[PDB]
Design a protein around this ligand. Structure first.
Ligand SMILES: CCCCNc1cc(C(=O)O)cc(S(N)(=O)=O)c1Oc1ccccc1
Ligand SMILES: CCCCNc1cc(C(=O)O)cc(S(N)(=O)=O)c1Oc1ccccc1
Ligand SMILES: [Cl-]
Ligand SMILES: [Cl-]
Ligand SMILES: [K+]
Ligand SMILES: [K+]
Lengths: 871, 871
């Protein structure tokens, strides 16, 4: 409260409201200003990741992959898939150990890492991918059970339909077991893991246990010549190495099935890393070991038959089959019985109890399917909670004591059932495999992008993640999805890009500190730094304007006109000076900053809103002109709206306005004054005095823009009579060397001539309330009144400023007579000597010159060399 | 002078000094502050471009190209080469019509368009390319003359040596005619052009004039069946279409041979466009017309022999040769006499007088060689004048009334002679052809890059150049140089990149308004705009610091320390407040801006120097804090050096320093104070009060950098006794959730305890000269002295600030006892209530706390939520 307090965790909690009644930080103004189920890492992320990786391939098609591709090359396949998977694991660990991750899985990580765009895109893709991987795992189980009940005669319908029936029944059962909370299905996956490990152990023991009954088959029991033969990549008619990797890689996916449970984990940012990485390690070790064992234990082909005798007749027999026995030897002529390349149930028979390995297949398939079916709706409901796609505002309610996406479970069940009864899993497989690849690629790109933008808030807790390995992982994921069904990769990239576009044009109104935001800041900073090293030059001058807008709403069309000759060229800083007590005005600026900056961005005003606190408008603008900008983006021109209200405004205010003029001149700023009717085809430019070229550059830049592109830029000047043609030719060659594509140059000799009586008497009537009438009251009352500036010095300030006023009024008359048909007028701003002219008289000059006309820009330049005709 | 003057061309002339005595612009301060041979376009750029394009191919190898590739495909070849050439012509015209081009050619255009890097690189490449194209043209003439003097028996030596002899003699003659001024060689090219056009006319007339003597040859005189046959692309054993285009394209090059004479043209920016484009038009028309005529007039092969009788025996004769006559019919069996595909002198014989066409070949070759030999040294001497490569500071003197590169002429003559006597022009041809391609590519990229950066000074006088056609031209040049000898294109790209690197690491100290500079500004502006649309978030906070450096030289290691936790992360604005009269201080700021900004860039300080003019340091820094920055790059922290001199400084100055502290607090700025020994392994952080997380973020960012990466970040806090273990565990979990990888957390209970007598008496002695001794002089003298702030209120300001001082001194003692071994110390900055504490007492607090210690950062934060453990 009154005294500063020691730091506590309570200060930084709930980020909007988290126990705010206790441990609330004291504000700087207060000190200064004077007066329900959660899973551990073992059973929540280790078991689930391990149990999701282990699927159909481990027990069915692995003997095939090690049989065709050689042992030394099948291990290469496994190692490449594991490099991709492990690099993605490090990336996921880096993302997960950054903050506290609320709910969902890969979606939440990627979204909160680098923006709702990639977040929503890849989250939707991953939710679909897991929802259908449910169907893939369950139909693998269907193939297993139908093979078992076709080898054992009893069957009900044709295989292509019995698979559908059994898959539908068991996916219904999977929904039932999953929809009943997560303690129950957690224990269910525990018992499935026990069964799976029993199957692995049975295979290992049986592989160490050879027998003569299986001798006719490829089973021989660790014979060295079998290993020597199987090292080679003995392929088949069609399957190439890339196709082999394509077959295997689905077995590599399934990691971060615990990360998808991040919403229900007891302690993320400590369970995700050492659960996912350790699960990948264990599963890869098991794959490699079992592959080398089965390759070293069984042979390619075996004419399994007792009639195949081990008598071993003395023949050449170059094949190493007869090296063990004449049985299962020399069957290459016709398609012999079975073997690694000719059978799949090798895994079953090399082991001991065939049931204890069959149960391995069922447990692996069910466990992987159940893990995917739990993971998909968590991701989906996290995605729907953020309402990136408002169409799915449902699927996020999550009925139950622990938020469980019942609707998400039903939706993923329907999707899985639909893809089961489609029964075309073979053709859909590459699409979904490289959806998984796309998700992994965006995770590694998540880490790389986060490390690329410095972002002091990046700072993850988990080391071992360096940026280049993550970039390599993204590249490898892209290359692998090219390897797997190139056109599927193109389709996946199209889907990603389409969702990206959809989200970036939706622009969900949400902010969670993307790495994209950090990169934006860092990029803008780096280019400002490189600009700071770029020396100035005439033909790279830009009108970079501080515009005393006030509130940017107050003068809209003025803002548009300035934006016209500053869009995509030069700077535009909309300055607004705030007033009054410091404490209240801090909050005033804080809200106006957001409001007006968003208003500019919404209205495509590439401008910069700069609020300052100051005692009055003059020294607030002094603040702005002195300090606004960054590097060589500091303003060089001050833009004002003509203070139309001076006849009614307090004369101190208009004096402040004129001293603003004078300050801008004093600190080497060009001044532009815009007088237009704000209630809401030639550009006429009367640039009678060489301001330095700015009075040319403004209309030319206006002609550059599309709005004024179809409008001539005819020019007027003043010159002595009898030299009219000479002056016009010199003017034409002068600005033809400036490449200002004029349309008609007019030369006026009527300047410096006494204007009509009506106009002079009108100006005298206007100035009468402020000319101080310095006739009587010689010095005492005269000096007493002059103790405040804003009166015109009758005698003193109308001696030569008499002809100054005459030129002003006559110029106004000339703009009436000649340029009244212009779409826009740009004319030299009159300059009065500092202190020599009463501010009232100078404002009267501006009124007299600028009144009753189309839009006017009274441009006076820095008197530098703004334009050039060199190169 | 005193009065503003009408604009005149004299104001913008010579850009440093050009008739400055007459027509000198009046300065804004003055108004405001109170008190020898030149060539026209016909003979300088039209004749030269036309006469350089027309070379060997027109009269020697063109019959070959139209004979092998079909008429409808030879015209396609010519049209593609002309598309490349004409797009480059539009680009060159756009570049040349921008400013006034001093001297040189393509070098000056490209350099002054987009920087000395591409300028010097491509200028050197083009100078070499023209220097050796001299050799190519002259050896073509050598082949012509040796063929003429071998058909006419008299010969001197073997052809491979007679060509060398005649080429050497005639290149010596070419030097002689070129080294004798440009009026003489201009008239020489005039007469060569007359000869060439006579040859063209003779060919046309002879082609309209058929005869029986040439009837046995391919000459038949516009027979329709000959045209119908020749439309097809009847190629040969080896020559493919791409090879054909490779042969032709050297004939397309040679444009901007007048642009290389830009230094000696009477009026560039009006001669270059309508000379180069018209010359390309005329030459392409002549190529196309002569190609179609010779294709429609002669046949592929002709067994030229009177014995070949036109008797026309009644045979099949599918070939259209016999359609005209049995002569020159059916010779395909063996290699028959000659023809389009079997002879080159067809051009000579289809015409009338063979001498009047032979003279055509000699005139074309000599004229092209002479044009190249004039153009190369102009480019070279322009390149050497800018001293981009200081090694060639010679070759630029240019002796003569008109600056003529005598040394350049000699150098190009030596290069041409060397490549003549090498006599390996066939193998070097693709290298030089795609050097020409590279130069054209950089010209089109010149225009595209210039149009890409808005740059109000771009604005060329010549329309018809839109940016996308120039980009297409650059792409086409790149593709064509791939077509011509791919590895030659790779070598050319390597040479370009190498010269680019050499120049960009040389960094010649010169500024001529590159388009690269404009692009740098525009890119930085665009990314600042996109940053302006990026909403704030806690975990994207950056310490973006306004550092009251003063002169950045004054405190170097302080600048380095701030740069350490701001490099590549957050902003760093080195503010310096200037003093005194406005007029002198304007120039002061103007010179200091350049000096200090260059000093920062040189010393790899990615900082921003911000000078302001102000009455005193306090309100200058007020200017800076209120207004510095752009968009969301405004500073959020104020960094000060501890005013070490306060014991000697005027007490008003240190009061100003403390009110600077207070202003920074008032406008919601965190404050960092650095006290280190500026005369010139654990980071200890004692962050006793929850500033909002900045006191953690600073040392962590220090640990991020390489300099401090190997240094622990151990932390100290204060806590009540009997809760030491609880407080330490809570602290550890708190900043482990903040991922600040601490090394040892220490908890101190000795805080809030009365420190030793020696330290308290030392502090009392220090504060004695300013405690105002408010014992006597009850109110009158007391209030009179208190009419100025900087004295300590003895009675009032030492009631509870007594225990404040006690904590300050005891904390100092503790830093001595514990953290004196640190490499750096970061501690909470004490905050005093505004106006409640005398500024002298607060400065004494800072002295007492910070004295006699390693580098200290007294960090006090905004009291916002700088750190977070969410995501
Ligand atoms: C992203 C992976 C989705 C699951 N698909 C899958 C998983 C595993 C495994 O073991 O995890 C093995 C294979 S497989 N038959 O070896 O290619 C798989 O492909 C299938 C499975 C059945 C139907 C169609 C395709
Ligand atoms: C960049 C072009 C340099 C000049 N080389 C050149 C010009 C012309 C032409 O007519 O301007 C025609 C040919 S050619 N024989 O048709 O390919 C040329 O190639 C040569 C010539 C002679 C020796 C070796 C190569
Ligand atoms: Cl996965
Ligand atoms: Cl050229
Ligand atoms: K799997
Ligand atoms: K040529």
């Amino acid at each position: 409260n009154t005294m500063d307090a020691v730091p506590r965790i309570d200060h930084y909690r709930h980020t909007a409201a988290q126990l705010g009644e206790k441990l609330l930080r004291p504000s700087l103004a207060e000190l200064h200003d004077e007066l329900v189920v959660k899973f551990g890492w073992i059973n929540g992320v280790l078991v689930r990741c391990m149990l999701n990786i282990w699927g159909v391939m481990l027990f069915i098609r692995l003997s095939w992959i090690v049989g065709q591709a050689g042992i030394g090359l099948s291990v290469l396949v496994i190692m490449m898939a594991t490099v991709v998977t492990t690099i993605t694991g490090l990336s996921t660990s880096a993302i997960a150990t950054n903050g506290f991750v609320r709910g969902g899985g890969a979606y939440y990580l990627i979204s909160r890492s680098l923006g709702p765009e990639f977040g929503g895109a890849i989250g939707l893709i991953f939710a679909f991918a897991n929802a259908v991987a449910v169907a893939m795992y369950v139909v693998g189980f269907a193939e297993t059970v139908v093979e078992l009940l076709k080898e054992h005669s009893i069957l009900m319908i044709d295989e292509i339909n019995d698979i559908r029936i059994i898959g539908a029944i068991t996916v219904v059962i999977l929904l039932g077991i999953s929809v009943a909370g997560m303690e129950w299905e957690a224990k269910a996956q525990i018992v499935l893991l026990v069964i799976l490990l029993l199957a692995i152990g049975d295979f290992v023991i049986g592989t160490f246990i050879p027998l003569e009954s299986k001798k006719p088959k490829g089973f021989f029991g660790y014979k060295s010549e079998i290993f020597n033969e199987n090292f080679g990549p003995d392929f088949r008619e069609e399957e190439t190495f890339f196709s082999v990797f394509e077959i295997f890689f689905p077995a590599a996916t399934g990691i971060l099935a615990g990360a998808n449970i991040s919403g229900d984990l007891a302690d993320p940012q400590s369970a995700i890393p050492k659960g996912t990485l350790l699960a990948i390690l264990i599963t890869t070790l098991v794959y490699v070991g079992i592959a080398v064992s089965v390759g070293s234990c069984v042979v390619r082909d075996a004419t399994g038959n007792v009639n195949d005798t081990i008598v071993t007749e003395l023949t050449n027999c170059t094949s190493a089959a007869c090296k063990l026995n004449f049985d299962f030897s020399s069957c290459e002529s016709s398609p012999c019985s079975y073997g690694l390349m000719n059978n799949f149930q090798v895994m079953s028979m090399v082991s001991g109890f065939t049931p204890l390995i069959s149960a391995g297949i069922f447990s692996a398939t069910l466990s992987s399917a159940l893990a995917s079916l739990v993971s998909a709706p968590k991701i989906f409901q996290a995605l729907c909670k953020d309402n990136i796609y408002p169409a799915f505002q449902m699927f996020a309610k999550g009925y139950g004591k622990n938020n469980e996406p019942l609707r998400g479970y039903i939706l993923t069940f329907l999707i899985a059932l639909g893809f089961i009864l489609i029964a075309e899993c073979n053709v859909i497989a590459p699409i979904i495999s490289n959806f998984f690849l796309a998700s992994y690629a965006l995770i590694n790109f998540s880490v790389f992008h986060a490390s690329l933008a410095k972002s002091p808030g990046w700072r993850p807790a988990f080391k071992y993640y360096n940026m280049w390995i993550s970039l390599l992982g993204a590249i490898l994921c892209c290359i692998v999805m090219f390897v797997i069904n190139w056109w599927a990769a193109l389709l996946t990239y199209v889907i990603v890009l389409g969702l990206y576009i959809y989200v970036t044009y939706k622009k969900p109104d949400v902010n969670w500190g993307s790495s994209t935001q950090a990169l934006t800041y860092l990029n803008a900073l780096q280019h400002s730094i490189r600009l700071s090293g770029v020396e100035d030059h005439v033909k790279n001058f830009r009108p970079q304007c501080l515009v005393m807008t006030g509130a940017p709403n107050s003068r809209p069309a003025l803002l548009h006109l300035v934006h016209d000759f500053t869009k995509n060229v030069g700077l535009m800083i909309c300055g607004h000076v705030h007033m009054g007590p410091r404490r209240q005005a801090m909050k005033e600026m804080s809200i106006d900053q957001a409001k007006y900056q968003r208003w500019l961005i919404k209205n495509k005003m590439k401008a910069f809103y700069a609020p300052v606190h100051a005692d009055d408008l003059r020294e607030g603008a002094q603040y702005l002109m002195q300090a606004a900008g960054l590097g060589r983006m500091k303003p060089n021109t001050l833009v004002l709206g003509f203070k139309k209200d001076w006849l009614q405004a307090d004369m101190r205010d208009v004096d402040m306005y004129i001293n603003l003029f004078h300050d801008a001149f004093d600190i080497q700023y060009g001044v532009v004054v815009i007088r237009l009717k704000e209630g809401l085809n030639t550009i006429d430019v009367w640039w009678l005095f060489d301001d330095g070229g700015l009075t040319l550059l403004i209309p030319y830049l206006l002609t550059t823009k599309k709005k004024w592109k179809d409008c001539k830029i005819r020019v007027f000047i003043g010159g002595k009579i009898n030299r009219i043609d000479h002056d016009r030719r010199a003017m034409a060659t002068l600005l033809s060397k400036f490449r200002i594509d004029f349309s008609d140059i007019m030369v006026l000799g009527d300047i410096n001539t006494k204007p009509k009586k009506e106009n002079i008497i009108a100006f005298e009537e206007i100035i009468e309330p402020y000319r101080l009438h310095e006739d009587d009251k010689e010095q005492d009352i005269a000096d007493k009144m002059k103790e405040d500036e804003p009166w015109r010095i009758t005698d003193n300030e109308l001696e030569l400023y008499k002809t100054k006023t005459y030129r002003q009024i006559r110029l106004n008359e000339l703009l009436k007579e000649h340029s009244s048909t212009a779409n826009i007028i740009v004319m030299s701003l009159p300059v009065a000597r500092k202190g020599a002219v009463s501010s009232a008289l100078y404002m009267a000059w501006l009124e007299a010159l600028s009144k009753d006309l189309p839009p006017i820009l009274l441009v006076r330049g820095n008197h530098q060399s703004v334009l050039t005709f060199y190169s």
